[PDB]
Amino acid sequence: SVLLQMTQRLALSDAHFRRICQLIYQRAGIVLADHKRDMVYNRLVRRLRALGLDDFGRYLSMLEANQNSAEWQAFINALTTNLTAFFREAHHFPILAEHARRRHGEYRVWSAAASTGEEPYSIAITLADALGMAPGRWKVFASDIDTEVLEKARSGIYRLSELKTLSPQQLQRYFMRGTGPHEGLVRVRQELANYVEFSSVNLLEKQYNVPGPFDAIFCRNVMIYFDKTTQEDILRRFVPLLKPDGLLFAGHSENFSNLVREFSLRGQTVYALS
């Protein structure tokens, strides 16, 4: 009753790995480590198979040849790191609500690395609680370079355990719980989902197609995958996108001020135009 399986087993050479690293760096600015190679292999072989290739050299050539193919997106999605959580670095939220309470008119926020949507929905919940759900008062724009995580973000479905940081009131007001097969699952209510717009934006663009200026820009835990030149380039692009007294929120381990002096620290990893 034994019938050994065996599906296609290809080989990622040192040379090919180095090539993958250069390509993603030039494209998305992401700097990969040598300890991610087994991971890179497991996620990329699936592309080789789907396309019917059995050579990493041939795959990389189709990519290098055609700089605009849809395959470039599958390549990117395979190598990004999307770890996130609802209300991560929670100290930022009371600060945002504080800022919003002042700046009247339309309060606009840009979440520059949305991942699967946890950060933008955290922002929306904070604003809905602070300002109330009323059309015209505030809006959240969210983007990411990865289209797989953006599609999940757009669906707004999460497992109830991922929401341990919400109060029973936020849960009731902003989500619908599931029953039967898809239970233990909740979905963001359409009412709250209408206040956030999702779009794919690669931070390495020399020009962003975003509805700025913004009162606040969240750029948390992404700069960590880029190098300093790349980081400085992006930060300088955020400058014209910030309204006069706007806020730039960075990730726990990021220090922006040391990259561009036009930014100044104001709170727990929060910057303001100097």
Catalytic pick from 108, 144, 146, 215? 144
Q: Is 151 annotated as a binding residue?
A: no
Residues 236, 260: contact at Cβ < 8 Å? yes
Q: Nearest approach, Cβ of 201 to ligand SAH (angstroms)? A: 6
Query: How far, in Å, CA of 26 to CA of 270, rounded?
Result: 29
Q: Is 221 annotated as a binding residue?
A: yes
Catalytic pick from 43, 47, 137, 154? 43
Query: For the chain, how far is it from start to end, CA to CA, in angstroms?
Result: 73
Q: Nearest approach, Cβ of 225 to ligand SAH (angstroms)? A: 6
DSSP conformation letters of 54-96: --HHHHHHHHHH-TT-THHHHHHHHH------TTTTTTHHHHH
Which of residues 100 and 123 has its CB atom nearest to ligand SAH in the complex? 123
Q: Is 220 annotated as a binding residue?
A: yes
Q: Nearest approach, Cβ of 63 to ligand SAH (angstroms)? A: 17
Residue that is written with structure tokens 């999605």 in the block:
77
Among this protein's residues, is 43 annotated catalytic?
yes
Whether a cis peptide bond, with omega within 30° of 0, leads into 213 is: yes
Residues contributing to the site for ligand SAH (CB under 6 A): 28-30, 80, 82-84, 88, 113, 115, 119, 144-146, 149, 202-204, 220-222, 225, 251
CA–CA distances in Å: residue 253 to residues 28, 222, 225 = 21, 10, 12
Q: Is 203 annotated as a binding residue?
A: yes
Which of residues 19 and 92 has its CB atom nearest to ligand SAH in the complex? 92
Q: Nearest approach, Cβ of 12 to ligand SAH (angstroms)? A: 22
Q: Is 179 annotated as a binding residue?
A: no
Q: Is 77 annotated as a binding residue?
A: no
Among this protein's residues, is 54 annotated catalytic?
no
Which of residues 10 and 97 has its CB atom nearest to ligand SAH in the complex? 97
Query: How far, in Å, CA of 115 to CA of 29, rounded?
Result: 16
Q: Nearest approach, Cβ of 136 to ligand SAH (angstroms)? A: 26
Residue that is written with structure tokens 């300890």 in the block:
35
Phi, psi (5° rounding) for residue 263? -115, 145
Query: How far, in Å, CA of 58 to CA of 51, rounded?
Result: 11
Which of residues 133 and 241 has its CB atom nearest to ligand SAH in the complex? 241
CA–CA distances in Å: residue 173 to residues 90, 251, 273 = 20, 28, 35
Binding site, by residue number, is 82, 84, 88, 119, 144, 202-203, 220-221
What residues form the annotated binding site for S-adenosyl-L-methionine?
82, 84, 88, 119, 144, 202-203, 220-221
Catalytic residues: 43, 144
